[PDB]
Design a protein around this nucleic acid. Structure first.
Lengths: 79, 100, 113, 150, 98
RNA sequence: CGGUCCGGCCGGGAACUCAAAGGAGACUGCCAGUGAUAAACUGGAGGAAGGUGGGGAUGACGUCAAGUCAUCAUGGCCCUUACGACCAGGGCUACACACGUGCUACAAUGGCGCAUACAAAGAGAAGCGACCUCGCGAGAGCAAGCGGACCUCAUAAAGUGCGUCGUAGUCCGGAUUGGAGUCUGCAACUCGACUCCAUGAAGUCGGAAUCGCUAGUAAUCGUGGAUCAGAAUGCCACGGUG
């Protein structure tokens, strides 16, 4: 939305570019970032995104190049 | 309303006069207009907007007497929760009972 | 003769059955009428065989109907596969207009008999 | 209450010199847009000019001469009972009654321009030839025949 | 060579403050004109009459902003010096400009 | 009526307007009539105005000992290793359904496009912004006038008039859905506004039943301000038609 070629990353991600396509042998990286965006190449990076109580296992394709981290991390369940 | 609300403006309002009302009119020192599709300024401008609480936004005057935000009226000099008791004491110059 | 309109009414101005329907738009679809010799003010009947060849000349420039609906539908079906906010709201019958389902969601809900 | 009008004065039509044609545009107009009503008056008289046997200068007055009653029926409370009584239709209303019925008829119609909707009723307003149209006058025919109790 | 201003809200204080300025300006200048006017303004506002709810009950307040260009006949160096220390009570606002 | 920054600009005036103050004038004064013949009323003359001239400001005793310690204090109680406050992420615009009210239309006493007549009241220099340029466009970029009574915000709009059109969910509308952008701002994904190429639905009186005032009043169209980094249709005001 609004921006040609999509925005540049947050500075708190600009310091985390060594963990952009790989998390390692460790548990999927716990992320409270929801207003920040994804890296333009990010597949193979295992992450868990906050929902307001817990962290959820999110799924991302190699074709996703600009989305807010909250936009694909659900918060509700019906009744 | 809380006693914490009384000093919440102190840093915010100071940077409003310092930068947050001219930095866009003076932006030509942190900008370039000669290179096509080339960035050398975004990360230093995002570093300038890295600090929080003090913003061009978030800025509210409040009732400094009570911490209450709502019912502020600049034309009265005082938030309406205290206006009648102050204006009938004669404390606000030159508010009086004269009606329509 | 007709070129893009499919409805029954006869002898109208050269815009109502010429523009703003199924994919043809109104921005370039009206400028071609002067080359065909057709006027855009007041009802007209000069569009026939011969005049219409100047309009049948426009090829590969635009798309209409189901192929234009394919363009938007696939551009949402790629998102309905994913955990995206508008993904589930187009996989399930949910609004995206930022609505209050306590008060107004009437287009998305329906009758109200 | 008591210390009230009556009838407030209105200025007569500048072109025709008539106070009936002044009241007529006041009740004809809608949302106070009297400037459009000044284009409907006389424009609705197009098909009446030659047809008026009183000449054009009475081609609208003729539709108001058709009905000039002295009493109307009203249904009024005397206690736990409600009865039909004749009430007087005074000179000030006697000339303005049918005028108020013709504008309602034109507003309730929905074909052509308003200057043609008004002309539909005005064409028969002194002929009364239509079906179930004189039901309009049953409120005065029932008044010249009131019996009540004395 | 300067020009002057007087601004107030009180209908009598505007003349009492004029009578301070045109006298300070006459103490070092013998030629006279008397005060010139303009611009006057007015403003009105409404408030809720009670601090808690009661939003159907309201009270009416207004002000009248008075201003004079005043004019000075001789704005001489010795006369503007007397206006650098202008006092003149609180309750009004003034300017000196060139 | 001379001179002319060609201009109420200088000479001339202090009057009208426009903005401001203080008086005088309306007193049943005047006639006849009515009135337990009295209070005061009922008409006429004369007047700008006639009967507290007209319009405002004002809440007697009493009304539920009303709503509120969520603005306040202030007696008490409970929590204090917290029911306290500092960040951050979700929420206070969940929804198979109810209540509470407006605005714009459903049209042709109406809309649209192009002309054309006339404002009142407010806003404004880290401002109000006239223009031109790039472009599809928001807008960006520069920038006239002006210090806010001879500038900007600003073709008021409706109305008038011409061109055009129907009983068709319409020329219309463009509500909705993606894609592009434009602005402000850690940040507009989610809840923001403005724009463009495209697509495209609802509205042709509307449930039992019922609502409200007496004239510049109802009815109806534009203009302005507040809040404000960045949006209202809500809030407070202004004038036109009536």
């Amino acid at each position: 939305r609004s921006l040609k070629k999509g925005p540049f990353i947050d500075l708190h991600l600009l310091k985390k570019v060594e963990k952009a396509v790989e998390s390692g042998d460790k548990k999927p990286l716990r992320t409270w970032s929801r207003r920040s965006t994804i890296f333009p190449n990010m597949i193979g990076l295992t992450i868990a995104v906050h929902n307001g109580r817990q962290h959820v296992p999110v799924f991302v394709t190699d074709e996703m190049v600009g989305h807010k981290l909250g936009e694909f991390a659900p918060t509700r369940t019906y009744r | 309303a809380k006693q914490s609300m009384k000093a919440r403006e102190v840093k915010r309002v100071a940077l409003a006069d310092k930068y947050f009302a001219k930095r866009a009119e003076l932006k030509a020192i942190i900008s370039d207009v000669n290179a096509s599709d080339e960035d050398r300024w975004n990360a230093v401008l995002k570093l300038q907007t890295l600090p929080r609480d003090s913003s061009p936004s978030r800025q509210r005057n409040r009732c400094r007497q009570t911490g209450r935000p709502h019912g502020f009226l600049r034309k009265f000099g005082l938030s309406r929760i205290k206006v009648r008791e102050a204006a009938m004491r004669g404390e606000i110059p030159g508010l009086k009972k004269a009606s329509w | 003769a007709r070129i893009a309109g499919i409805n029954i009414p006869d002898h109208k101005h050269a815009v109502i059955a010429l523009t703003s329907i199924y994919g043809v738009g109104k921005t370039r679809s009206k400028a071609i009428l002067a080359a065909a010799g057709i006027a855009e003010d007041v009802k007209i009947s000069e569009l026939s065989e011969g005049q219409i060849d100047t309009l049948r000349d426009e090829v590969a420039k635009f798309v209409v109907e189901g192929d234009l609906r394919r363009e938007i539908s696939m551009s949402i079906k790629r998102l309905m596969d994913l955990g995206c906010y508008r993904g589930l709201r187009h996989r399930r019958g949910l609004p995206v207009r930022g609505q209050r389902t306590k008060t107004n969601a009437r287009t998305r809900k329906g009758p109200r008999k | 209450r008591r210390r009230v009008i009556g009838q407030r004065k209105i200025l007569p039509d500048p072109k025709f010199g008539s106070e009936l044609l002044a009241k007529f545009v006041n009740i004809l107009m809608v949302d106070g847009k009297k400037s459009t009503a000044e284009s409907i008056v006389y424009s609705a008289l197009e098909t009446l000019a030659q047809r008026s046997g009183k000449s054009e200068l009475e081609a609208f007055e003729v539709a108001l001469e058709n009905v000039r009653p002295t009493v109307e029926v009203k249904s009024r409370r005397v206690g736990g009972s409600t009865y039909q009584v004749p009430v007087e239709v005074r000179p000030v209303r006697r000339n303005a009654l049918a005028m108020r019925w013709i504008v309602e008829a034109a507003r309730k119609r929905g074909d052509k321009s308003m200057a043609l909707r008004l002309a539909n009723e005005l064409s028969d307003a002194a002929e009364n030839k239509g079906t179930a149209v004189k039901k309009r006058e049953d409120v005065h025919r029932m008044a010249e025949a009131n019996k009540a109790f004395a | 060579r300067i020009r002057i201003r007087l601004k107030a809200f009180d209908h009598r204080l505007i003349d009492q403050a004029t009578a301070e300025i045109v006298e300070t300006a006459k103490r070092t200048g013998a030629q006279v004109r008397g005060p010139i006017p303009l611009p006057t303004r007015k403003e009105r506002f409404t408030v809720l009459i009670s601090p808690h709810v009661n939003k159907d009950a309201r009270d009416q307040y207004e002000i009248r902003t008075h201003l004079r260009l005043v004019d000075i006949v001789e704005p001489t160096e010795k006369t503007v010096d007397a206006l650098m220390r202008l006092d003149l009570a609180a309750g009004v606002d003034v300017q000196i400009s060139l």
